[PDB]
Paper text:
The Staphylococcus aureus PII-like signal transduction protein PstA was recently identified as a cyclic diadenylate monophosphate (c-di-AMP)-binding protein. Here, we present the crystal structures of the apo- and c-di-AMP-bound PstA protein, which is trimeric in solution as well as in the crystals. The structures combined with detailed bioinformatics analysis revealed that the protein belongs to a new family of proteins with a similar core fold but with distinct features to classical PII proteins, which usually function in nitrogen metabolism pathways in bacteria. The His-PstASA protein has a calculated mass of 13.9 kDa; however, SEC-MALs analysis revealed that the protein forms a 43.9 ± 0.84-kDa complex in solution suggesting that PstASA is trimeric in solution, similar to classical PII proteins.
The protein crystallized as a trimer in the asymmetric unit, and the crystal structure of the protein·ligand complex was solved at 2.0Å resolution by molecular replacement using the apo structure as a model. The c-di-AMP bound at the monomer-monomer interface with three molecules bound per trimer. The main differences between the unbound and bound structures was in the T′-loop, which was disordered in the apo structure but became structured in the c-di-AMP·PstASA complex, thereby providing many stabilizing interactions with the ligand, particularly through Phe-36 (see detailed description below). In addition, the large B′-loop (amino acids 68–92), which was unresolved in the apo structure, was more ordered in the complex, forming two anti-parallel β-strands. In the c-di-AMP·PstASA complex structure, a salt bridge is formed between the highly conserved amino acids Asp-12 in α-helix 1 and Arg-67 at the beginning of the B′-loop. The c-di-AMP-binding site is overall positively charged due to residues Asn-24, Asn-41, and Gln-108, with the latter two residues being in hydrogen bonding distance with the ligand. Both phosphate groups of the ligand form oxy-anion holes; one such anion-stabilizing hydrogen-bonding pocket is formed by the interaction of the PO4 group 1 with two water molecules and the backbone amides of Phe-36 and Leu-37 (monomer B), whereas another is formed by the PO4 group 2 through hydrogen bonding with Gln-108 and two water molecules. The adenine ring Aα is held in place by a face-to-face π stacking interaction with Phe-36 (monomer B) and a π-cation interaction with Arg-26 (monomer A), whereas the adenine ring Aβ forms a face-to-edge stacking interaction with Phe-99, and three hydrogen bonds with the amide and carbonyl group of Gly-47 (monomer A) and the side chain of Thr-28 (monomer A). Asn-41 forms a hydrogen bond with the ribose ring, and additional hydrogen bonds are formed between surrounding waters, which are conserved across three monomers, and the oxygen and nitrogen groups of the ribose and adenine rings, respectively.
Author numbering:
A (entry chain B): -7 to 74, 88 to 109
B (entry chain A): -8 to 72, 88 to 109
C (entry chain C): -8 to 73, 91 to 109
The structure:
Amino acid sequence: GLVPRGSHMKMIIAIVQDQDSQELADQLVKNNFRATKLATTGGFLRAGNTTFLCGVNDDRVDEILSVINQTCGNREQLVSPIPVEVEVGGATVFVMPVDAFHQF
Amino acid sequence: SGLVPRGSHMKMIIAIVQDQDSQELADQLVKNNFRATKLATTGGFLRAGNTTFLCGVNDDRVDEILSVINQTCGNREQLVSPVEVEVGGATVFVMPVDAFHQF
Amino acid sequence: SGLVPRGSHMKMIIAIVQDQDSQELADQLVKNNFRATKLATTGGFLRAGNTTFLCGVNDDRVDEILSVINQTCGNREQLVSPVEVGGATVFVMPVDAFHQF
Ligand SMILES: Nc1ncnc2c1ncn2[C@@H]1O[C@@H]2COP(=O)(O)O[C@H]3[C@@H](O)[C@H](n4cnc5c(N)ncnc54)O[C@@H]3COP(=O)(O)O[C@H]2[C@H]1O
Ligand SMILES: Nc1ncnc2c1ncn2[C@@H]1O[C@@H]2COP(=O)(O)O[C@H]3[C@@H](O)[C@H](n4cnc5c(N)ncnc54)O[C@@H]3COP(=O)(O)O[C@H]2[C@H]1O
Ligand SMILES: Nc1ncnc2c1ncn2[C@@H]1O[C@@H]2COP(=O)(O)O[C@H]3[C@@H](O)[C@H](n4cnc5c(N)ncnc54)O[C@@H]3COP(=O)(O)O[C@H]2[C@H]1O
């Protein structure tokens, strides 16, 4: 496997809005984070979103989380019902353990 | 930071279900305040469409989410054509989560 | 209530492979009785299609599944431009429980 002795990888599963996905992807690339992206849909709104799977060494988790925050952070937008302020953007991130990482 | 209180644990549920049951599962998850993200997937053996749900849940609600999945997507008998067939079925993985964040 | 015998452990294999190798990997998984669910994905760098396989496997068959992936997708590098793109990237992840309903 590719993990040095005593170190650990994590799997980041980040669910972000489609409007922020290209900017996140560009920033992950710029910071040399590898990603795989999935076109997904939310259970509540049933609208398209984007899920990123990023395998990262534990020592770069805080950095990836800051990239995701800077690009996909929650913010307000005025909309008209049927002008009110609503939350848009935002990221939901799971950090999961990885036992091994291989490249063939 | 992270959304998990000290000493508690989250789990990630990966549920692979049939396409015909996916809308009822999604409705029931919503009704019970479970969040989900869904993926259109295909099976390795039959190469036919199915649906994969990713649900991050607190450990204390795992049994509850499993029961919702079972009730809505469990394997069962159905008359068609009148012939009896097996329909539905869910495969579920419960996986550990180190941290959970919202930004 | 799960499918995992007492004292044993399941793992989730997440294998990201190129679309050109996907069908042959799928056939070999099937032939060796490995279950897989496939996801149509795209790479973060090249933004081009690839395939992600999720395979829940008992720990005692992890080395075998890795050797299937290697035999089918390994030594399969190609240079491309939007860059070495490998045969397979595989994560082995822990699973607490496994259920069929
Ligand atoms: N039962 C409920 N009651 C009241 N409000 C509800 C609700 N379910 C969802 N919402 C609201 O709807 C937003 C979009 O949820 P959706 O399921 O379409 O789209 C979600 C979903 O695809 C994913 N997600 C969030 N938490 C998740 C989890 N625990 N597991 C899996 N996916 C999750 O992230 C997207 C953004 O979620 P976020 O939490 O930022 O934003 C949520 C939340 O503000
Ligand atoms: N350990 C695991 N890891 C990842 N994904 C998993 C999994 N177990 C199940 N799945 C997913 O769940 C679907 C339903 O599988 P199930 O075992 O209910 O129902 C299966 C099973 O009854 C049968 N089957 C699958 N592979 C087989 C094999 N090698 N030999 C005999 N029967 C097989 O065909 C059905 C459809 O399989 P298919 O592959 O098309 O579709 C699968 C697959 O997408
Ligand atoms: N740690 C990880 N987490 C999640 N997914 C992962 C991953 N490592 C690899 N992948 C997935 O596997 C595909 C093939 O990766 P590989 O590293 O062989 O081949 C890579 C690598 O040789 C190169 N590459 C990727 N990012 C790079 C960067 N920032 N700088 C230079 N080369 C890069 O581009 C190839 C294609 O990358 P692409 O992103 O389109 O597609 C990737 C991505 O979808």
